[PDB]
Design a protein around this ligand. Sequence first.
Ligand code: MG
Ligand code: MG
Ligand code: ZN
Ligand code: ZN
Ligand code: ZN
Ligand code: ZN
Lengths: 449, 449
Amino acid sequence: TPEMPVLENRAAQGDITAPGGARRLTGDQTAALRDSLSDKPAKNIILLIGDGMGDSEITAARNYAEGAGGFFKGIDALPLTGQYTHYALNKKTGKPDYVTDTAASATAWSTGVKTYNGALGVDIHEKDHPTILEMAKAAGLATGNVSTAELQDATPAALVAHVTSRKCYGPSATSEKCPGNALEKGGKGSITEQLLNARADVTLGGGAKTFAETATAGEWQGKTLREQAQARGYQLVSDAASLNSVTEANQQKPLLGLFADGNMPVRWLGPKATYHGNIDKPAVTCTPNPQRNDSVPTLAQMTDKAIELLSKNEKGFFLQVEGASIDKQDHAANPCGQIGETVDLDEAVQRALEFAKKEGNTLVIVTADHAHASQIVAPDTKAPGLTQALNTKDGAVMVMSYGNSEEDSQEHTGSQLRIAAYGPHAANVVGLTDQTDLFYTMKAALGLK
Amino acid sequence: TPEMPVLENRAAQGDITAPGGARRLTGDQTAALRDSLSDKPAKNIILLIGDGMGDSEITAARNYAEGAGGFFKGIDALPLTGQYTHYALNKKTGKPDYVTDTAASATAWSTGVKTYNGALGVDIHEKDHPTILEMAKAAGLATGNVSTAELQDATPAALVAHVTSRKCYGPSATSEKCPGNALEKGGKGSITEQLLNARADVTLGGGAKTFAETATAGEWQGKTLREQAQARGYQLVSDAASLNSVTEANQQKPLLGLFADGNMPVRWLGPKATYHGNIDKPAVTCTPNPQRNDSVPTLAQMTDKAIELLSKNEKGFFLQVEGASIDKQDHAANPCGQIGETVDLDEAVQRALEFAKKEGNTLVIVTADHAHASQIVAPDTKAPGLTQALNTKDGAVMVMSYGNSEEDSQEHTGSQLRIAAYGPHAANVVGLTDQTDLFYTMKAALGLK
Ligand SMILES: [Mg+2]
Ligand SMILES: [Mg+2]
Ligand SMILES: [Zn+2]
Ligand SMILES: [Zn+2]
Ligand SMILES: [Zn+2]
Ligand SMILES: [Zn+2]
């Protein structure tokens, strides 16, 4: 039952051109904040990650989708907020590496240890460290791992795989890139093979392609990783209808959803940003991607389904949800694809907050693994990188810039970024914290050994 | 034992290469945050603005001067944090202009009304609106306006001047660019003339250059603004010694510190970023500015003296302190200058918080007017803009990039950014808020009118 308030509205209250019209607040917040502070146990935890969703990304998406004075009913609704650092480590010196990749940062909040770019579930000495999901399982809690990316991708993989390189998707890549993790060499196996061992109750995302590979050793040698999953009691789903049909998910009948060969389709389509794209060409208006359709579950749908199936566990559950393509489209200098995935994440957050407020003992956290490239710049900007003009909900033009790479892919940035929470122990994301603190916050909130 | 705590130490607690070594937290923060919430009246308010100090700028400065796992005993010590928006307005359409200049954003928190870029103390209809400082004085409180920039610059000018274009420093510029404001045309006059009229208790900064002009009309026609100042009872100083000599600052003896012809000198010097600078040039170690001097008050000293002189007003006081050159050096693509001015601001913040913790009824706020260009990128980055490698306190290299402008000056970015506070009503900066909300938060905290 509700007691801890979720922000109902932080949109501009009135006429932004008039006095007080742009205010997002309507009164003193001292009482609301006191009502948002509780150190009682968190029975469940829902961690939503917007890959590469730094403050710049959130703002850009709000400006376009909700207007500058708009409000994300999900993402902007968490009452307790802070900024956290996500630097990685140089593998050889052990010193800080100011700009992390996704594997090292995900490893940080999932295990509580800093590591080098490319590492998954291991530290700079390549020592494995239990993940919050594995720990949740060990304590008897149900577990969920959701993502719009291929499941072998760094973010969701970090919770169930321990490999020296995030490139080790299946047996093939592992034998070549992670010889020490290769199953035929006595290791724990590829990311996909370990994911199958982790056996989370609910796992949803893309990445069906790798399951086509066959094991090089072990009990299921010669069989495809898909056959192995089937043989190990997994219930495989491939689309919205089949997913909807699922009535239960547990260790006896673990759910594995493979909704795309690789990454799942993005929500919006738009051209890539170009050189002086905001000076020469006209303004862009994003448009829905036909490849999305109803046969493909949305992030909000996968979130709702996971909560349903996971909440059946009376002891509690841990669930991670990732809006993976915000980062990917940021890399491809594509504003529409980028913003569309942020809107996507916001819906997933709303579903989490909606459940969390009713349940009353659920901690919800929303943040990103690292900052990214996109910047909001003046309309008449003449930049050296890639830019694009966009027609926002405000009926005005917003220009986005990607200027940190001459190479084909735009890159991550080291700036600290927003982390927000709601529920029991949400106080621990306020002020300045580190990405590794999040692991300890989740561990403590659930009261894990 | 001051009820409300100031974050003592949120640096990495140990060996960052070890599990938990990078944690900034040592325990649950629920109790600490509760102790930080109070709705009692704020007797005093100290507003510190890092011009252009976005989260990226804060992160870069911390990385270089304190190390990635370091901690700004000032900037990072405020316990209540949020993210706010600072979009401006298109003067003709009234629609949002996603990237604001300094004038419009300062007007936003100074008057509570959004406006067009370049405007100072007026809305899009060119109508004046009271500033938090003008209101504080009228309420019988002591008023202080401190900056490391020429006092006619947008940030400190927004608290005492109402003109259509921030370029209207003195009579000359005003008659040409702000005719409707030009004194000899019935207007209230230029920025400097209006500043003299505002007559704040303490005004410290640079910009003596403009005081050489002579009024075109009014009671002090033909007389220089400096002369007018002296003739109107103003107590002027021009160096550290002369400033340290003042023992009182009031309406009959208003203090006016002019320590430089234009902007005050920066703390650190370094090479300007260049094309592929991080690749073609050696990593840089910032060098102290020989011109920094010792007869020139530091931001921290001006801040400290302002508090001494203003704290005598039993009613209370309002003080705004601006670390102005963070932005200016960010425009110049000079990491060392930018970082040094952030370190400078941090010292002033420490003084503010030290006083606030003992006074017990002081609201301290640290934020910025808008985001900027600088980004922290990977060491091997090959970007199209300007870059540079730096030797940080960690004994590691950090690369910074400025890639949003082929023109002479790097530009602002529209990303929402950090705002933090300590003391009575500090809860009002938590979560998502708008820059105009800051005006009402300060007004209500002091309980004006
Ligand atoms: Mg990812
Ligand atoms: Mg300024
Ligand atoms: Zn990422
Ligand atoms: Zn990425
Ligand atoms: Zn500025
Ligand atoms: Zn500027």
